[PDB]
Amino acid sequence: QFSEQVNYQRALEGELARTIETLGPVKSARVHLAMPSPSASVTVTLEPGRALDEGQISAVVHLVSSAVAGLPPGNVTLVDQSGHLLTQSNTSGRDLNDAQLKFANDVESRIQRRIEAILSPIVGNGNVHAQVTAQLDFANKEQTEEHYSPNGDASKATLRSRQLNISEQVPRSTQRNETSNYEVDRTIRHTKMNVGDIERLSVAVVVNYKLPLTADQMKQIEDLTREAMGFSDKRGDTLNVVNSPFS
Amino acid sequence: QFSEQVNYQRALEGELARTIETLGPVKSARVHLAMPSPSASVTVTLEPGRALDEGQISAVVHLVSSAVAGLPPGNVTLVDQSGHLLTQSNTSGRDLNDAQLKFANDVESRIQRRIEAILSPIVGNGNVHAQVTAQLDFANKEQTEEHYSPNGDASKATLRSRQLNISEQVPRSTQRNETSNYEVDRTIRHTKMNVGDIERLSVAVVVNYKLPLTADQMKQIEDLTREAMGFSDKRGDTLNVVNSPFS
Amino acid sequence: QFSEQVNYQRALEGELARTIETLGPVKSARVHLAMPSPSASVTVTLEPGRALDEGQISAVVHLVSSAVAGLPPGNVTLVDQSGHLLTQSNTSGRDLNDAQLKFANDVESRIQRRIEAILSPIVGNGNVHAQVTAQLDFANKEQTEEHYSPNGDASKATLRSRQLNISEQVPRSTQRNETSNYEVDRTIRHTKMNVGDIERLSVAVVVNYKLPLTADQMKQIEDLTREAMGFSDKRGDTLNVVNSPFS
Amino acid sequence: EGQISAVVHLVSSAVAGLPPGNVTLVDQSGHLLTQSNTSGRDLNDAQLKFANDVESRIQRRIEAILSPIVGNGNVHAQVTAQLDFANKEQTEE
């Protein structure tokens, strides 16, 4: 019964390593599994004069992380024929953070690619450059308001019950008890903010000469960029456009 | 008994990979299953000089996600013969924010494609460019109002019970007790806001010269875009149209 | 049954050692496992005239730590054909101060090269030398604030209940009981500081003669490296720049 | 990224007992190309590799917005960022 779940694992390892071989840069792989939480250790041997890129590692990681039951991609270990541990594995902590750099590099790559496109026709195909910086927010934030509406005014209160004894005598020994149980308007927001929204934008744009550009001809260039960003003084965005001869 | 549910899985993998082969661009597939939450890892080898499109990936994902019991499409891993992990529902770095850009692009692509299309007949085919920026909202928001109607005015209250004792003597030692048990109107909305609604738009439109365009002719060009946008100042949209010769 | 889980371990050891052989600098490996806590002991025999680098050790450590169920990389022992225990983790009196020195040498290395890169253009490709020392902070430290906002002022209290009894007779025999129950707004931070922050930098910078450099030319050289440092008086950093003929 | 290991192993192997983790490659524009990895926690260094990328970006950005103004090589810029890796939380009410 034990040599049942072992003669099988030895076949999985030999099957998983037959696909990683049929993968291009890899000449021959060699994978061992550790199923008792599980782990794996691929040992690819790249073709002569080749090296797996940064996104070609996740190809071989997920190729094994998914073909094995319950194996996260944080346990797969990839190693070349020249040492060179390619996976991160070893750090159980501050991985998955370059992701927040890649992402922030795309949020800015777009605003940049856009500003050039909306400004290249006016000033020329290559007479303008623009760089973008975006302070993002990755704080996992939640919220739960629970607003009520005031009912201090009788004219807009909503009684559910009400008791009201009003004695009197005449020695004007009066009296007035009262009870009240209200019902209350009750809103309940429950947000869960988006991880990756933009906190503040800062964009600098250089535009070539012609011979400088006219004051208005620049002011109208400033306002286009003010739109290609989504310039919002709420966020505290900062734009700075300058015209200067290129080289 | 174990080699029963393993000799079978080895046949499923060999059957699933025989169909993905008969799929056009794919020359030979190689799938492993991880049935224990399950997973799969296809390893298609596209035909010489071919590449699966963005909707041709879901073809091969759902082709396997559905042929295996209890396997969501977020666990299927597709990989070419050149590395290149094609899926993403497999990564867990952020795995979502990277898709909010590919969405906010499309929202902006439409309003861009639309704006030029409403203007291309007026000012010529290529004599106009527009770029759109959309600040979307991906905050998973909810709500639950619970409104009541003010039954303060006895002329629109709704008693369920009532007990009005009264006394009097004559030293006008009166008395007046009174209970009440109202019934109350009670609305309950329960919204679950949409994730992806536009919060603010900023559009910049450049139009070519002909010679400049007429003063009023700009206002009519501005208004068309104010419509093709869906401009709603309540959202704080911003539009800026300029006219300057192209190159 | 025992010779079942032993005939298997003897095969794992022979399989694990067949991959470490196919690894470049290694000519022949020899691994023993210690299943029960666990452990391993690789005994690589490097090729004639070779030595595993500092990152080539983790290649062979994780190559075995991952191929064995429940084996952390702190239990793998790597040894050459010339003694030379390459791992540590087995050398554990503290197992950590061996690292704080190497790590503190990296932090000081970064700041050093950066002061050499920002300054070499002004003064020459070799006419500047800098040395950095960094008092790091490796004290594990947590924290938990629990702030409350003051509600002594009634105009900003949040009553949850109340009971304001009053009396009087007129010989003014007054009386005024009063209870209260407040709701209190309560921030709760919970930090967990970083192990490896910088406490203080001290940087010494020598620059060659030209002929003694000018005061302004020195005044600005001090201002630049003050930024390449990250000089912050709060930390009480210390920078000392001197100009003196080299040799 | 694979042309660096070409020049690293070209020297790591031509010298007796020199691992590739000790070879340092530098351009004519600063830009330390190597880095490797240290030991002990294998995480504190991960806060340096990260803190280096955050600074390389702001550097690549500053030179790319100035190169047109002043010339393809007439500007250098070095960035030093004090990051913050304190795992913080909070709960207002």
From Swiss-Prot, chain D:
- Intracellular or extracellular location(s): Cell inner membrane; Bacterial flagellum basal body
Q: What induces it?
A: Inhibited in nutrient-poor medium.
Q: Name the domain of life.
A: Bacteria
Which regions form coiled coils? Answer: none
Question: What does the similarity note say?
Answer: Belongs to the FliF family.
What does this protein do, in the record's words?
The M ring may be actively involved in energy transduction.
Instruction: Spell out the subunit comment.
Output: The basal body constitutes a major portion of the flagellar organelle and consists of four rings (L,P,S, and M) mounted on a central rod. The M ring is integral to the inner membrane of the cell and may be connected to the flagellar rod via the S ring. The S (supramembrane ring) lies just distal to the M ring. The L and P rings lie in the outer membrane and the periplasmic space, respectively.
What's the protein name? Flagellar M-ring protein
Name the species this protein comes from.
Salmonella typhimurium (strain LT2 / SGSC1412 / ATCC 700720)
